[PDB]
């Protein structure tokens, strides 16, 4: 999370260099001119990628990110009244925008949740964003 395209190019280059650097047993000082063995017979494996990700590469990202979330409605079951209410307040003004114009009801522009601390508020707020395919 947070990497950009140049950082991922650097990640690929660092993983390839770590896979080269583990093969110093053949890439020796006695063979200054490197033979054609390791030049085409060295493939990178997964822990090289995990090393190059872990040991290095600080992410150059701190600002916000726009995406569709991937949490689902059955991730928090129950609350069928709240599900019906959030469907009535988010889905219907965008999936059927003509019926709101047939008899002129203007859509609302936001609700305010309130409750005890830590009962899945954000995990409920992201669910309608995922269901509506909304950022």
């Amino acid at each position: 999370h947070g990497h950009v395209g140049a950082d991922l190019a650097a990640l690929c280059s660092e993983a390839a260099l770590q896979a080269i650097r583990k093969k110093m047993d053949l890439i020796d000082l006695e063979d200054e001119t490197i033979d054609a063995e390791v030049m085409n017979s060295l493939a990178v494996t997964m822990d090289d990628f995990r090393w190059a990700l872990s040991q290095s590469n600080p992410s150059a990202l701190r600002e916000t990110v726009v995406e569709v979330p991937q949490v689902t409605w059955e991730d928090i079951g129950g609350l069928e009244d709240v599900k019906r209410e959030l469907q009535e307040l988010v889905q219907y003004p965008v999936e059927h925008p003509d019926k709101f114009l047939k008899f002129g009801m203007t859509p609302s522009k936001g609700v305010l949740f309130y409750g005890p601390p830590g009962c899945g508020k954000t995990l409920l707020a992201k669910a309608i964003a995922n269901e509506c395919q909304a950022n």
Partner: protein
């Protein structure tokens, strides 16, 4: 007129809410009625409604009869007495009252 004289102490911003709650309560049923019409089991071309059935073409009576149940007056009686008391803080033409010029 029957809805007028029933809502007695309601402010002007409270009964403008129930004529949006009734609209929301009818839009819920008009969205829901289109679900079963496309989800007809063995939706065959036989006996098909080529005309639009229009189950809710307009706001009926029971939408207001159900939307009225959530009504609530916002302003109490204890705070309208505050504005009446400020109206009494203006002296409000009190004192001597009527006098007449001599003839």
């Amino acid at each position: 007129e029957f809805l007028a004289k029933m809502t007695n102490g309601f402010s002007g911003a409270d009964l403008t809410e129930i004529c949006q709650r009734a609209c929301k309560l009818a839009i819920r049923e008009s969205i829901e009625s289109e679900i079963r019409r496309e989800r007809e089991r063995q939706t065959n071309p036989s006996a098909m409604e080529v005309e639009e059935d229009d189950p809710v073409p307009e706001i009926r009576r029971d939408h207001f009869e159900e939307a009225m149940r959530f009504a609530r007056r916002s302003v109490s009686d204890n705070d309208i007495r505050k504005y009446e008391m400020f109206a009494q803080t203006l002296q409000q033409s009190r004192g001597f009252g009527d006098f007449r010029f001599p003839s």
